[PDB]
Amino acid sequence: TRPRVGHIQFLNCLPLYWGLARTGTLLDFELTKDTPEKLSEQLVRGDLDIGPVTLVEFLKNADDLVAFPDIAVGCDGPVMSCVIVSQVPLDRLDGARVALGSTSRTSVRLAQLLLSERFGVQPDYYTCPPDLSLMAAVLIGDAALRANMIDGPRYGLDVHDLGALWKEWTGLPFVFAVWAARRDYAEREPVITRKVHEAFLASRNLSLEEVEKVAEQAARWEAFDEDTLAKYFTTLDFRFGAPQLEAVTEFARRVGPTTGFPADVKVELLKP
């Protein structure tokens, strides 16, 4: 039976989706589209076999997951779709209520790690659906991209790029999500899992070469113009090698104790 594969519904993985379709890979999957928060839980509980897993959640289940090498959702400097929209300087929030978009699990944690370490602030947090209107807030995905390219500039609100703040603070890149197979599925289905892995790399590679076509196509249906989408797609960094694995190890060391996993948690990788 086709492996049950998750896919983030956001624009950040649209180029990858274009790749999955263009190569014919989609016909080898039983695909589920949803937000990262949900896809993560579904994989953990066994409702999915392979899929994207927000980093924080992946580390909490590191013993039961095996990450795919060479593909992830990250950055090296700005990410553009993982931000903090605020109406006051980040230093002035030690007692201010900050809303955390419920679709996020890694970006919200990182946002906290920065507000308290770089701006020395202990905010009064609360989680809610992403909306930037109803709700100084941490947004990811399309909501964050809209807040960065449209809402922020329209209503003169400040939009801080989380990938940028991390880079400035550590000089390191960042990984928000990785692809993983449940350990039981990888062992039960060694061949399929490897084939899925290779199909994702192949699809990702093609999305890199046809980035302009994806931007043009999506422009037809998104609020973002072609140039913005093209810029966005090229800004995202889907690599997952040693340099990226270094950003993870570091992040895991800084948040591991107060998040649910050893500061030195082991990241098992799918072996060739």
Added chain:
Amino acid sequence: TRPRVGHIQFLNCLPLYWGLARTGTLLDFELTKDTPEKLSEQLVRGDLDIGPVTLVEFLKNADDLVAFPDIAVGCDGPVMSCVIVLGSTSRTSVRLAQLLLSERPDYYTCPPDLSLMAVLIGDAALRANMDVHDLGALWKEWTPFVFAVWAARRPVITRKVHEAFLASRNLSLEEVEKVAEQAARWEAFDEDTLAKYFTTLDFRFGAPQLEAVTEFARRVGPTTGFPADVKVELLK
């Protein structure tokens, strides 16, 4: 904003799906997969903008649907996936069977889920087919045939959807061998069976096909709820 497009979940449209993917067409649709019966009901009531419509339902609603020329789900001899081993997923084949088996019974409808009760279509029919007869071959051993057509609910989007469907169907014809190899990995049919099946299906919709529709219509129209001379309004 994206047009809501229906797609028959059966293997008969897997090659077409391969094509919708290969060309990237899928990213321009908000696609819904289901059985022909439901996809037809969905379009007629407005839950879909464009999609496949089993012939009988298209004709019954011919004044409110514009068909796409040059593509449909037909045959010119056996179809393999429409047999007589009434399945509830069918609206056209079942009617064709009532025509054959009467001019060449005590009918009752139920779920095309075998192991019970028979007229079948889709995957269930091709799985039962491999006694078993062939509706496409019997109609061919009597008088081609068009089981379903693509149609939009009666502007520019509609036009490009049509073209994208055409481009996607054309690519699937030249890559049918690929669709078969991949499909054999998960279906119950071996590669050659599927390759034979995909190549057996006839997806054209021009003169030789529109001809077979007027003849099916004239033979059943009166006893099937639509004018014996209903007009099929092709997209301009």
